[PDB]
Amino acid sequence: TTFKRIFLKRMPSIRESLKERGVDMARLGPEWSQPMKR
Amino acid sequence: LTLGNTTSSVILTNYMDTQYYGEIGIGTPPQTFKVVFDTGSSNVWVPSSKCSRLYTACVYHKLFDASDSSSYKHNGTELTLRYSTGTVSGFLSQDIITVGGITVTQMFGEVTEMPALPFMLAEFDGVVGMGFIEQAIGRVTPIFDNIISQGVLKEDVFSFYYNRDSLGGQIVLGGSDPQHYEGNFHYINLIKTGVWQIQMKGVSVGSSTLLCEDGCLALVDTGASYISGSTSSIEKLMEALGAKKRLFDYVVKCNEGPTLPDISFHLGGKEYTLTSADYVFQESYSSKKLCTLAIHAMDIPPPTGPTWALGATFIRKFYTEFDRRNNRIGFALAR
Ligand SMILES: *[C@@H]1O[C@H](CO)[C@@H](O)[C@H](O)[C@H]1NC(C)=O
Numbered sequence A: 001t002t003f004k005r006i007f008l009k010r011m012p013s014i015r016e017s018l019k020e021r022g023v024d025m026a027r028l029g030p031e032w033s034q035p036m037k038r
Numbered sequence B: 001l002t003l004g005n006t007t008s009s010v011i012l013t014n015y016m017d018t019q020y021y022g023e024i025g026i027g028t029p030p031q032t033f034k035v036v037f038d039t040g041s042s043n044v045w046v047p048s049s050k051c052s053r054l055y056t057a058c059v060y061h062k063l064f065d066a067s068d069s070s071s072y073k074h075n076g077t078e079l080t081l082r083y084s085t086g087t088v089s090g091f092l093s094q095d096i097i098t099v100g101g102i103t104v105t106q107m108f109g110e111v112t113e114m115p116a117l118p119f120m121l122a123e124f125d126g127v128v129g130m131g132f133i134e135q136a137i138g139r140v141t142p143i144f145d146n147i148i149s150q151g152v153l154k155e156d157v158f159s160f161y162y163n164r165d166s167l168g169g170q171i172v173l174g175g176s177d178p179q180h181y182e183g184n185f186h187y188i189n190l191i192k193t194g195v196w197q198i199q200m201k202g203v204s205v206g207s208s209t210l211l212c213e214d215g216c217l218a219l220v221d222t223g224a225s226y227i228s229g230s231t232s233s234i235e236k237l238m239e240a241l242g243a244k245k246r247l248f249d250y251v252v253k254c255n256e257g258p259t260l261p262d263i264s265f266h267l268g269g270k271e272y273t274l275t276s277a278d279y280v281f282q283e284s285y286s287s288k289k290l291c292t293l294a295i296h297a298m299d300i301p302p303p304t305g306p307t308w309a310l311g312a313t314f315i316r317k318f319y320t321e322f323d324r325r326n327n328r329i330g331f332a333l334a335r
Helices: A014-021 B143-148 B231-241 B312-317
Strands: A004-010 B020-026 B031-038 B044-047 B073-082 B087-094 B097-099 B102-104 B107-113 B126-129 B157-162 B168-173 B181-189 B197-205 B209-211 B216-220 B250-253 B263-267 B270-274 B290-292 B307-310 B318-323 B328-334
Touching: B020 B044, B020 B168, B031 B044, B097 B143, B102 B143, B157 B312, B181 B197, B181 B318, B197 B231, B197 B307, B209 B231, B231 B250, B270 B312, B312 B318, B312 B328
Parallel strands: B031 B126, B044 B107, B216 B307
Antiparallel strands: A004 B020, A004 B168, B020 B031, B020 B097, B044 B126, B073 B087, B087 B107, B097 B102, B157 B168, B157 B318, B181 B328, B197 B209, B197 B216, B197 B263, B250 B290, B263 B270, B318 B328
16 A cells, blocks of 8 residues: 565575584485475 | 476476565464565465474474464465476465565465475475466465555655665565666566566677577566576587586686676667676685686576576676566666
């Protein structure tokens, strides 16, 4: 009515968190698995 | 999720790269959650207090406890998001949901099953689907349709803005702010009603139109952050870009980073150019260190696919207005 806003706040992405923890990308399981996204 | 067959079964539920969350309040008194606002899905889901499977990931997040809400009204219908392994499952519930001042009565998913992996490392609790009922699992009224029926909005539209840097960004409900964009909005009609997907006539690299000739589809997913497009197309685009596969992402040498060409998306007869600074993470400039582009593969099957997907990086440069009333997507140069 006046302009309602949803404030989007910055958070660390899953990819960013994996990098910070030092998780080896190849060691997440096979191609079929599929580290959930689609 | 994987499930080919239906329109509400093939949903890009990325979140691998998602740097922005919003907040919702469910129940009386309100129970707050950090949620991803995805224009790719149409379901509202939060971890449930009824989740108990030790290897689930509900443990690492805020749970909705129906018992603590006076305004709670149960349904019970099961909903399932199938992946190769395993599933995002729960049951349907109804309660009072508040988004940026707007309060509605919502049919949301009380999640009792979350995978391993990747959900433990997700800083957000759940998902708020900004799509149409056609993509909603169980044909439940999506958040936006419910907000529309309250007659609170000036226009039955919502627009996404991603800030200069890092609150970090914002979703304008009931219109689009003129302090977010410059110039005029170019309105592109949707391919089909029920999905934020538009017609793309071609993708150009440099001079120089290479791929997407003879038409192609392009999704506008806010839950996503990168630019998706079929392996064969991204394999062509990346070989032309002089980049090599480093698994899940494509890389270039940090020194040759800004020297790279320009990607152009032909949408609605207009030139939507994306320069090296827009699609490359320039954390380094050393010829030894590697810089991530991305732009990644992602193969979407029918009915949703084969399709391209324009994420948060496209919306960062192009202020996107989502018109539910006129079934169109409007782009304007962000500022
Ligand atoms: C749940 O809601 C749906 C409408 O989407 C309806 O068909 C069904 O009967 C409801 N069930 C209960 C138990 O309220």
